[PDB]
Enzyme design. Sequence first.
Site, PDB file in Angstrom:
ATOM      1  N   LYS A 111      27.315  54.350  37.894  1.00 40.81           N
ATOM      2  CA  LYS A 111      26.112  53.937  37.191  1.00 40.81           C
ATOM      3  C   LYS A 111      25.609  55.084  36.284  1.00 40.81           C
ATOM      4  O   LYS A 111      25.016  54.821  35.206  1.00 40.81           O
ATOM      5  CB  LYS A 111      25.060  53.423  38.194  1.00 40.81           C
ATOM      6  CG  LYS A 111      25.445  52.088  38.880  1.00 40.81           C
ATOM      7  CD  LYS A 111      25.228  52.080  40.409  1.00 40.81           C
ATOM      8  CE  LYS A 111      24.130  51.147  40.914  1.00 40.81           C
ATOM      9  NZ  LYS A 111      23.671  51.480  42.313  1.00 40.81           N
ATOM     10  N   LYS A 193      38.106  37.945  41.243  1.00 40.67           N
ATOM     11  CA  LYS A 193      37.140  37.025  41.808  1.00 40.67           C
ATOM     12  C   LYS A 193      35.943  36.886  40.861  1.00 40.67           C
ATOM     13  O   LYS A 193      35.424  37.880  40.338  1.00 40.67           O
ATOM     14  CB  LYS A 193      36.719  37.465  43.220  1.00 40.67           C
ATOM     15  CG  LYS A 193      35.645  38.547  43.301  1.00 40.67           C
ATOM     16  CD  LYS A 193      35.868  39.572  44.418  1.00 40.67           C
ATOM     17  CE  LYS A 193      36.611  40.811  43.909  1.00 40.67           C
ATOM     18  NZ  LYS A 193      36.806  41.827  44.977  1.00 40.67           N
ATOM     19  N   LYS A 196      28.921  37.448  39.655  1.00 43.60           N
ATOM     20  CA  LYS A 196      27.539  37.460  39.094  1.00 43.60           C
ATOM     21  C   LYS A 196      27.343  38.262  37.795  1.00 43.60           C
ATOM     22  O   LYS A 196      26.634  37.814  36.901  1.00 43.60           O
ATOM     23  CB  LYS A 196      26.532  38.049  40.126  1.00 43.60           C
ATOM     24  CG  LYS A 196      25.783  37.051  40.999  1.00 43.60           C
ATOM     25  CD  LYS A 196      24.858  37.717  42.039  1.00 43.60           C
ATOM     26  CE  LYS A 196      23.355  37.697  41.679  1.00 43.60           C
ATOM     27  NZ  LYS A 196      22.396  37.825  42.841  1.00 43.60           N
TER      28      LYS A 196
END
Lengths: 332, 331
Positions: A111, A193, A196
């Site tokens: 991040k 997969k 979100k």
Amino acid sequence: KPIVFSGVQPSGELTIGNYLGALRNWVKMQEDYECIFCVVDLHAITVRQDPVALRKATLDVLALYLACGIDPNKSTIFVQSHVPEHTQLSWVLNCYTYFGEMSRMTQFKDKSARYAENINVGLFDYPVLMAADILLYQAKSVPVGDDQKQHLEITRDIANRFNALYGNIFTIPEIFIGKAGARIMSLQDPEKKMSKSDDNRNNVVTLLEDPKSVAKKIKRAVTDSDEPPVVRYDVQNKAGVSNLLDILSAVTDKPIADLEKEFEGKMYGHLKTAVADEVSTLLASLQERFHQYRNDETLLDNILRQGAEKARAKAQETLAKVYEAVGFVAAK
Amino acid sequence: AKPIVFSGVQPSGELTIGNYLGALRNWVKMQEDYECIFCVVDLHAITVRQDPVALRKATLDVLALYLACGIDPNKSTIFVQSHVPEHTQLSWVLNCYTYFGEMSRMTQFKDKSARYAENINVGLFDYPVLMAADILLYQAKSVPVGDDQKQHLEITRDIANRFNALYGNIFTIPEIFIGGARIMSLQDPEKKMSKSDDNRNNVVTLLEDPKSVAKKIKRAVTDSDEPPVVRYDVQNKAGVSNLLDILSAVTDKPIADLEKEFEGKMYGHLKTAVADEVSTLLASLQERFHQYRNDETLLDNILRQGAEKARAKAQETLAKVYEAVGFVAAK
Ligand SMILES: N[C@@H](Cc1c[nH]c2ccccc12)C(=O)O
Ligand SMILES: N[C@@H](Cc1c[nH]c2ccccc12)C(=O)O
């Protein structure tokens, strides 16, 4: 009943993968576990959020969970910021957490690369607040994605460290290994997969997504160039078509082998129409329920009040013991 | 419309006459003109390892010492930090608007990081952000801070300015408190009297027996001037000047009037007067101390009153913070 705690980021950009995999499972766990669903608005602001959208998204994720069948008379559902004890515990745990344990975190490092303009202390201290979120409720089990495992491990290490000094104050939580639901891959990257957070929006189907929008996304689902085309399950050679069949099976409850019979001699187009039709049927049902919940703001506020109240009573039992142990004068 | 002053008070049972005659006796007096807030910072205490029994004791000792000195709970707000959840709530939000680099470059953290290396905890890193929350929660205009805490006030101001810039004028921007005697050590009067001195002859604590007081004053260092003279001169007569400062602060007699009173007299006379005046003060403080400190019910009621006031103030600011960043308000 064993206590399961799950942190839920605010969004309501849950996919059919979130629903068919995990949420459908959660709905059934309500009977046999004491489930706790915490919408983690405090964690959300570790990256810059638009305020109006954060508020809307918090309510969207709540109403979505209710629409999926999470029941506030069986589960405890609440907003993280409505329960002061979360931040109170995190301060105490910061004092028992090594600096080096936070700086070694994979998530912090990633991040920090992605948002170098806002490398804040919240981003660094994320894992301790996460530890506090779990330990407050004496949770035995916590489901985490593969990316969140190092965070659950540090939670265990902090709890054991504190317990070694002061006695058995915390339950040492374990990873929750689910019944496991539908394998649901990304529509244009079948090897990954559905997620979100994904930037390519053609990879996902969202729960709130429009029937004509669903139809487009499935239309442009990647499929192989087998000639003639054949609708057969083979993850190795036909990831694209196999995913479409996993989705179809998941929604209709029809065995994969039966779907193969149904589509012998058909084109990938026929399979895509069925998948869009059946996904939009499920989603129409979810969406109608969502719309009832989302628009009844008095209901939502009541659910949240009830839930925060329940959460606060349990959290206070733990926090009082912590405050006694470290040596604080108890408020009277 | 009284200006708000916020002070963080470290749990301690060991305050000295230097604490009282320096800062505390003046805080007591300014209760008239300022809205004074005294927060006993038990959360900050545990950034270093604490004896739980001693922490609990020191929390109640410092509260009973403040009350004994004249801090009045109906005039000031006096409370225990851990009793007001809003402190940690705000500090989390402030973490999210505070750069890693800002905490990394605090002098206090660097010094401790060189000493402890890998053993340092996150608490010691994040200490300044809770301190900012402590202050900003109450809309404090002024804060007394040590020299060693000046950097923590600067970062509080940066954080608050930054948050205001994004969300509108939510925080007051705190400034250093402006405007007692500097009481020095009895056996090393070039050194300030420190409550945590290993030479107990350097210090007079507030809970000291009046025979122990006379002992330490009689032994205070003076000078070997010939002739010896009771005259104020910090450079050349540190020890005698310090006894004169003690006597002046305790009695409220200007130094020039004392010089006149001790004209032709000896250091022994000065030491006798200092011992007598200090033991009178401490008797009166000790009695008050024991009255409050032994009265558990009263201390519980005072802390509860304190925390109810602090929570009411804190919530005004915290509700606006939570709204600004985009949280759903609890209903
Ligand atoms: N970090 C989690 C959200 C979360 C916060 N606290 C938690 C506690 C338990 C499980 C998950 C969480 C995520 O990335 O999605
Ligand atoms: N850091 C201060 C204690 C403190 C915490 N919060 C504060 C706010 C204002 C002034 C002081 C404080 C000290 O060591 O003395």
